[PDB]
């Protein structure tokens, strides 16, 4: 029963996603809100007949997103609640971004990406993903809130699983809207921070730093990590960034980080560390699905320890040590330092 | 908090999981790997992919439980993966290919429009109702026949242990496909005689299966239209995964044909999803609400409650005598239907 059931689960994933994508697109979590909503009331809220919306809501209830309390009356589960825009841990923008054509249409050509080793995004939309997003403000803002949604799991745990006490300054290279650094600064009140981001993402970081009340302890600057990373910090973070890039580009980024570490600086690579032998993984987001997403969108990849250490060696760096996060997060903390010779 | 988030992440990334499985099926990787351990460099030549590209796909497949990486670059199938072999007696290869084909997936890209209109999106995308289309496309017809065999194996294996066929001399399967259900029944009950009633194109697939099974001397194949009639004279009639293909008016017509054929001493066994009044999660290998939405987008059919089916029986001069369960992993029930007083 189990062997067949698992294959049936894998094969019918795309249809499950379309049900979830409809819930997010129709903003049904917000329409339902806290309490019990009548399907006839919800139908008028998003120009659908009652019968059709009832069948979608029955499906969402079967997939664990809603509960049918009485016939035609639905409430959100804890899972459905996370699609509310107003949820403190909202994954709404995460759901919209990963069900948007910009992240899904490149997967229709997964085969061609595997054959070429190059992303399919470019041919579908006319440019590399980051140039496209720099030119599409709505999607760039969606992207920033999506990486926030994903990073909450890591942000909530990183302080318990890494010792930040020895450091006075920390720079987050590709630090997004500052979700990671603000969590770290809130738990370490003597610590000062910098976010280094693209022009477009840095404006999101500025308003997050203000809203977090960290204006006096966290600087926000824009620049290009293919140029020089600003020097003199004791700790540099780089989270969910190296996996966006091929090996030649990762060497250039690590090279820029090496100049910035100088003598005393340490680099903390926050990313999936793939095992040498691939097996099922308890992480909330599958690391091998992450690998193939990075391929189709950006021409990046997830890496083993040995693989990343090889790229470190080309940048004049070495892996000191790899620290785990709780099994559900699926990211590790790779401590990287300059190579004596 | 943790569980609620994890389940939502599982639902959102189903479409990417399905693209990895679709790639495995399309590239015939299950066959290329076979019984043993296969090296990625050998498999790379068997499907015209570079080694790195294929290795990443196989590592994703290992992550999703479809195979195992015993040594770096060396892969074996799991129980789950082995069901995608064409040589497997319980193969779901054709089922996998059918449900990842444009003909079943493109209608899901307009799920919303189907919910709004209550009409299938298939017709707009391909130019005719699904059964018309398949009558005029022999390759998709043959794939469909093999697909339903794959689905029906779970019902076929269990139906004898959960229903007493001993009281009956003759059994007619109304829309019985390639004969998978009735050949399972006849193999377990040596004194039983059977008839498969199907469209002219599918009946050729059924006659092929019946001859290959050595059952020609107690299994006949008859073709026609169950809107016109069902072949009379049989003790037990079966109609499996068929009523859910049609709207209420069409179901009533099918059930009127069955009624005529039942006469006095005939009995009908409707084998289909029985939806509860309140939608909740289900341990079935195939989600019945996703079945509901597949029926909508492909055919404008639907899954139905007991009470709904009972009033459709009433309009045909039939009543539900009782409902019998199958093991929870199957997700279908056996509804006994008899002439009304
Ligand atoms: N050339 C470049 N210079 C600086 N930042 C860049 C860059 N190209 C991409 N980025 C940034 O790299 C980030 C990668 S996504 C990771 C964001 C954040 N660290 C998190 O884990 O949530 C994006 O925020 C993007 O804006
Ligand atoms: N007008 C018609 N007359 C008879 N059979 C029909 C029909 N229209 C469709 N069918 C058949 O009804 C079946 C529905 S699919 C179910 C097939 C089989 N009972 C199984 O469970 O595996 C198809 O095989 C299709 O060919
Ligand atoms: C199961 C797959 C989950 C994938 C999550 C994902 O894609 N993260 C992501 C993206 S999308 S564009 C740039 C980035 N950087 C990232 O870290
Ligand atoms: C996750 C649910 C998928 C259900 C599979 C499905 O729809 N089977 C099916 C089809 S496809 S065309 C005609 C039919 N008749 C059926 O019983
Ligand atoms: Cl200030
Ligand atoms: Na700095």
How far apart CA B178 and CA B146 sit, in angstroms, is 7
Do B120 and B25 share a structural domain? no
How far apart CA A298 and CA A270 sit, in angstroms, is 18
How far apart CA B223 and CA B202 sit, in angstroms, is 9
Do B166 and B132 share a structural domain? yes
Looking up tokens 């006659």 gives B207
Ligand 1 pocket list (CB less than 6 A) = A 130, 147, 151, 174-176, 179-180, 197-198, 201, 224-226, 239-241, 244
Domain contains B292: yes
Structure token digits, residue A276: 């040498």
Containing H/E element for B70?
Answer: strand B67-71
Do B113 and B31 share a structural domain? no
Do A152 and A30 share a structural domain? no
User: b or e along A161-188 (b: 16 or more beta carbons within 10 Å of the residue's beta carbon)?
Assistant: ebebeebeebbbbbbbbbbbbbbbbeeb
Of B82, B102, B120, at which residue does a domain stop?
B82
Structure token digits, residue A119: 């992303």
Of A89, A114, A284, the CB nearest to B9: A284
How far apart CA A276 and CA A222 sit, in angstroms, is 37
Domain contains A191: yes
Domain contains B209: yes
Q: Cβ distance A324 to A264 under 8 Å?
A: no
Residue whose C-alpha is closest to residue B15's, from A141, A329, A106, A153: A106
Do B205 and B98 share a structural domain? yes
Domain contains B62: yes
How far apart CA A176 and CA A181 sit, in angstroms, is 9
Q: CATH number of the domain at A20, please.
A: 1.10.10.10
How far apart CA B5 and CA B118 sit, in angstroms, is 32
Do B287 and B147 share a structural domain? yes
Domain contains B106: yes
How many domains does the structure of chain B reveal?
2
Do A151 and A28 share a structural domain? no
Please, which residues have CB within 8 angstroms of residue A189's CB and are 6 or more apart in sequence?
A: none
- The edge-to-edge listing of strands for the beta sheet with B67-71 is B38-39, B74-77, B67-71
**Documented resolution in Å:** 2.2
Q: Cβ distance A285 to B9 under 8 Å?
A: yes
Sign of CA dihedral B147, B148, B153, B155: positive
Domain contains A112: no
The pick from B295, B297, B303 for probing ligand 4's pocket by mutation, whose C-beta has the most ligand atoms within 8 angstroms, reads: B295
B89–A contact, CB cutoff 8 A: no
The domain in which residue A326 lies consists of: 147-338
How far apart CA B179 and CA B171 sit, in angstroms, is 12
Do A160 and A36 share a structural domain? no
Contact: B287, A59; criterion CB under 8 Å: yes
Half-sphere exposure of A17 (CA within 13 A, CB side): 28
Does the active-site annotation cover B41? no
Tell me, rounded to whole angstroms, the distance of Cα A169 from its chain centroid.
24
Contact: A288, B115; criterion CB under 8 Å: no
Structure token digits, residue B298: 């492909």
Contact: A291, B56; criterion CB under 8 Å: yes
Helix axes B14-26, B51-63, angle to 10 degrees: 120
Q: Cβ distance A110 to A133 under 8 Å?
A: no
Residue whose C-alpha is closest to residue B16's, from A330, A272, A297, A78: A297
- Residue A319: Cβ within 10 Å count: 18
DSSP state of B270: E
* Distances from the Cα of A256 to the Cα of A235, A264, A266, A333, B261, angstroms: 14, 15, 13, 19, 81
Q: Cβ distance A229 to A257 under 8 Å?
A: yes
What is the Å distance from ligand 4's center to A242 Cα? 42
Domain contains A227: yes
Q: Cβ distance A247 to A262 under 8 Å?
A: no
How far apart CA A330 and CA B5 sit, in angstroms, is 14
Domain contains A190: yes
Half-sphere exposure of A190 (CA within 13 A, CB side): 5
DSSP state of B79: H
Do B99 and B74 share a structural domain? no
Q: Cβ distance A133 to A297 under 8 Å?
A: no
Do B112 and B231 share a structural domain? yes
Question: In 3-state terms, what secondary structure has residue B75?
Answer: strand
- Residue B150: Cβ within 10 Å count: 22
Of B28, B52, B82, at which residue does a domain stop?
B82
How far apart CA B51 and CA A88 sit, in angstroms, is 44
Looking up tokens 């990842």 gives B100
How far apart CA B272 and CA B288 sit, in angstroms, is 10
- Residue A300: nearest ligand to its CA? 3
Helix axes A13-25, B288-299, angle to 10 degrees: 80
Sign of CA dihedral B77, B80, B82, B86: negative
Do B97 and B78 share a structural domain? no
DSSP state of B106: G
Looking up tokens 């959960």 gives B162
Of B82, B104, B131, at which residue does a domain stop?
B82
Structure token digits, residue B89: 């007696």
Vertex A44: Cα angle to A43 and A49 (nearest 5)? 45
Sign of CA dihedral B265, B271, B272, B277: positive
Please, which residues have CB within 8 angstroms of residue B60's CB and are 6 or more apart in sequence?
A: A278, A286, A288, A289, A291, A292, B20
Do B163 and B20 share a structural domain? no
Structure token digits, residue B265: 């001493």
> Which residue of chain A comes nearest to B329, CA vs CA?
A1
Q: CATH number of the domain at B286, please.
A: 3.40.50.150
CA distance A172 to chain B (A): 26
3-state secondary structure chain A: CHHHHHHHHHHCHHHHHHHHHHHHHCCHHHHHCCCCEEHHHHHHHCCCCHHHHHHHHHHHHHCCCEEEEECCEEEECHHHHCCCCCCCCCCHHHHHHHCCHHHHHHHHHHHHHHHHCCCCHHHHHCCCHHHHHHCCHHHHHHHHHHHHHHHHHHHHHHHHHCCCCCCCEEEEECCCCCHHHHHHHHHCCCCEEEEEECHHHHHHHHHHHHHCCCCCCEEEEECCCCCCCCCCCCEEEEECCHHHCCHHHHHHHHHHHHHHHCCCCEEEEEECEECCCCCCCCCCCCHHHHHHHHHHHHCCCCEEHHHHHHHHHHCCEEEEEEEECCCCCCCEEEEEEECCC
- Strand pairing of A37-38 and A192-197? unpaired
Question: In 3-state terms, what secondary structure has residue B5?
Answer: helix
């Amino acid at each position: 029963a189990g062997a067949r059931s698992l294959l049936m689960q894998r094969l019918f994933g795309s249809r499950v996603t379309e049900v979830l994508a409809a819930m997010a697109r129709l903003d049904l979590a917000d329409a339902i809100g806290d309490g019990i909503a009548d399907v006839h009331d919800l139908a008028r809220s998003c120009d659908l007949p009652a019968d059709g919306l009832h069948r979608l809501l029955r499906a969402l209830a079967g997939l664990g997103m809603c509960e049918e309390s009485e016939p035609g009356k639905f409430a959100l589960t804890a899972s459905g609640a996370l699609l509310r825009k107003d949820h403190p841990e909202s994954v709404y923008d995460f759901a919209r971004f990963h069900t948007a054509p910009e992240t899904t249409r490149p997967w229709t050509n997964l085969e061609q990406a595997l054959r070429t080793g190059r992303p399919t995004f470019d041919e579908h939309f006319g440019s590399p993903l980051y140039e496209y997003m720099a030119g599409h403000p709505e999607l760039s803002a969606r992207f920033a809130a999506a990486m926030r949604g994903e990073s909450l799991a890591t942000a909530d745990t990183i302080a318990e699983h890494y010792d930040f006490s020895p450091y006075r300054t920390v720079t987050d290279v590709g630090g997004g809207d500052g979700t990671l650094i603000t969590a770290i600064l809130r738990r370490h009140p003597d610590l000062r921070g910098t976010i280094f981001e693209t022009p477009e993402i840095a404006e999101r970081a500025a308003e997050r730093v203000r809203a977090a009340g960290l204006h006096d302890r966290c600087a926000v600057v824009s620049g290009d990590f293919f140029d020089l990373v600003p020097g003199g910090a004791d700790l540099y973070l780089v989270k969910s960034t190296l996996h966006n890039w091929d090996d030649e580009h990762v060497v250039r980024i690590l090279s820029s980080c090496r100049t910035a570490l100088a003598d005393r600086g340490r680099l903390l690579v926050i990313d999936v560390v793939l095992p040498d032998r691939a097996e099922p993984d308890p992480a909330e987001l599958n690391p091998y699905v992450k690998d193939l997403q990075m391929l189709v969108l950006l021409g990046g990849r997830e890496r083993t320890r040995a693989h990343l250490d090889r790229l470190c060696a080309r940048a004049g760096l070495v892996i000191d040590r790899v620290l785990p996060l709780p099994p559900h997060v699926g990211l590790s903390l790779t401590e990287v330092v300059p190579a004596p010779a």
